[PDB]
């Protein structure tokens, strides 16, 4: 339920010599901070409204840690070239996800730490925060290194300690934004294709967050083994939108129902085709 | 606060 994440990305680029580091931090699936090297004056910016209050002694704090990460990836990126015998001066990507999950009780539930290289998985910190999982043979090099160097301890001390301690604080303020939501505004549309056949598309606009569900049905019976559904798309206004469709014989429109399920809704939205 | 990776690189 209550989780904090940090997605990091370092991307090598042709001739540029220096990679582009981008650190994005999430709180309950909601971005609240972001760092980017390319920026005019590279540093952490508050991506959320409730972060504006944080003192400068915190922004000069993070950016200094970000600058530190940036170099770590820079070095780690050169090491990989060796492992895979990739040549220098080229585009390669190294990503990292890390954060902590909390249960109903605001004690730590699970810790997260995993690296990826070139899209693929590389090495990950297991659920016990003691051992490592190595994807390909190269990662077994990194693991052996991190084993004999006692790397796990450092990450566990964070996930459990500092990580959690700060998520609480981010929830002492976030619990005034990540609670309010916008509701869907569904409406079926009628489109004709092929002789004696029409597609009925059930739209749903203006909802937040993106998590939602659309259902078609025949005479009341659940239908999904035949429907066409498109992934949730961002409206671009802070809200999202989605729709599903069905192909049905002409003159049989009113037979179908379209129920819409969303968080910020008191009760499912049953819809039908109008004149 | 974000994570500050272990000194040991990849």
């Amino acid at each position: 339920p209550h989780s904090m994440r940090y997605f990091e990305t370092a991307v090598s680029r042709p001739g540029l010599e220096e990679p582009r580091y981008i650190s994005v931090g999430y709180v309950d699936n909601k971005e609240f901070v972001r760092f980017d090297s390319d920026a005019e004056n590279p540093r952490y910016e508050p991506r959320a409204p409730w972060m504006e209050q944080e003192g400068p002694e915190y922004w000069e704090r993070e950016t200094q840690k970000a600058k530190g990460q940036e170099q770590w990836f820079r070095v780690s990126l050169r090491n990989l070239l060796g492992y895979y015998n990739q040549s220098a001066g080229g585009s390669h990507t190294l990503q990292q996800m890390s954060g902590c999950d909390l249960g109903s009780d605001w004690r730590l539930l699970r810790g997260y730490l995993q690296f990826a290289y070139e899209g693929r998985d590389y090495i990950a910190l297991n659920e016990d925060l003691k051992t490592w999982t190595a994807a390909d043979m190269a990662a077994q090099i990194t693991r052996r290194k991190w084993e004999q160097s006692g790397a796990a301890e450092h990450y566990k001390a964070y996930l459990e300690g500092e990580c959690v301690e700060w998520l609480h604080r981010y929830l002492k303020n976030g619990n005034a934004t990540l609670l309010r939501t916008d509701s869907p505004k569904a409406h079926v549309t009628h489109h004709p294709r092929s002789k004696g056949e029409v597609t009925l598309r059930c739209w749903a606009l203006g909802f937040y967050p993106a998590d939602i569900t659309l259902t078609w049905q025949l005479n009341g019976e659940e239908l999904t083994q035949d429907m066409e559904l498109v992934e949730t798309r961002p409206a671009g206004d802070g809200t999202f939108q989605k729709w599903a469709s069905v192909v049905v014989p002409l003159g049989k429109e009113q037979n179908y129902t379209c129920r819409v399920y969303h968080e910020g809704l008191p009760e499912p939205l049953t819809l039908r085709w109008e004149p | 606060s974000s994570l500050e990776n272990f000194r040991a690189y990849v």
Partner: T-cell receptor
Amino acid sequence: DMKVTQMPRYLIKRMGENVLLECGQDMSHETMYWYRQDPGLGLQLIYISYDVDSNSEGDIPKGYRVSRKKREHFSLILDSAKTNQTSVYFCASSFGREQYFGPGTRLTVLE
Amino acid sequence: KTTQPDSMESTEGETVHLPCSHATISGNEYIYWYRQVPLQGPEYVTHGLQQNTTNSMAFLAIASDRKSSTLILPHVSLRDAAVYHCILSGGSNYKLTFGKGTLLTVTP
């Protein structure tokens, strides 16, 4: 297995001259160090290279400059030697665990 | 930072104790122990975060809830005479600052 070496072990030079101490590991550790310690005090950090052209000051940067063009090597430069810069110099390297120190270079800067 | 006694007397056989008071510890920071025999340069002995690590040579014992620690040297010999340093090294930092440690003399 884990050896770090520094050439010119001993070196005497007249004040104002160009001093160049070298240090090699042949194990390609990402990070290397330059320390000095006088019979008086103990170890103080001069420079630390995290990797090739990535070098950062330290505690006693004034009077020294460094050059990291290969992981294996790490050279210490004294443009204008100074009498008080007559300490003992230690090079080191690490990969994440502890630091692996060299044998030490004894530099006497005579007037 | 840390703090250690300047000197420390011992004899050929006795098992030595080397204190190292170190409160105000980030807990994100490890504790390393280096030995520097005169002439030579510092070499690594052991390190630990919590619990109680150990090596083929010495035993490291970190006090409960940090704030202090102690290095144990078993049946010591002459060659075990030097200056033992107790440094705090952050898990994300290659820099470690040497004090002047503890000059351990071992009488035969």
